[PDB]
């Protein structure tokens, strides 16, 4: 749900993005 802020989170949340993908 809330699909807008997922695009924002993918730029302003690299902290989450590295941890979920685990390849940073």
UniProtKB/Swiss-Prot annotation:
Keyword Cell membrane included in the entry's annotation: no
GO-annotated biological processes: defense response to bacterium; defense response to fungus; killing of cells of another organism
Record-level GO cellular component terms: extracellular region
Distribution of this protein across tissues and organs: Expressed by the skin glands.
Source species, domain of life: Eukaryota
Pfam families xrefs: Antimicrobial_1 (PF08018)
Subcellular location(s) of the protein: Secreted
Matches recorded under InterPro entries: Antimicrobial_frog_1
Keyword Disulfide bond: yes
Keywords linked to the UniProt accession: Amphibian defense peptide, Antibiotic, Antimicrobial, Cytolysis, Disulfide bond, Fungicide, Hemolysis, Secreted
Family: Belongs to the frog skin active peptide (FSAP) family. Brevinin subfamily.
Role description: Antibacterial activity against Gram-positive bacterium S.aureus and Gram-negative bacterium E.coli. High antifungal activity against C.albicans and a strong hemolytic activity.
Protein name: Brevinin-1BYa
Protein source organism: Rana boylii (Foothill yellow-legged frog)
């Amino acid at each position: 749900f809330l699909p807008i802020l997922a695009s924002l989170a993918a730029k302003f949340g690299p902290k989450l993005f590295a941890l979920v993908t685990k390849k940073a």
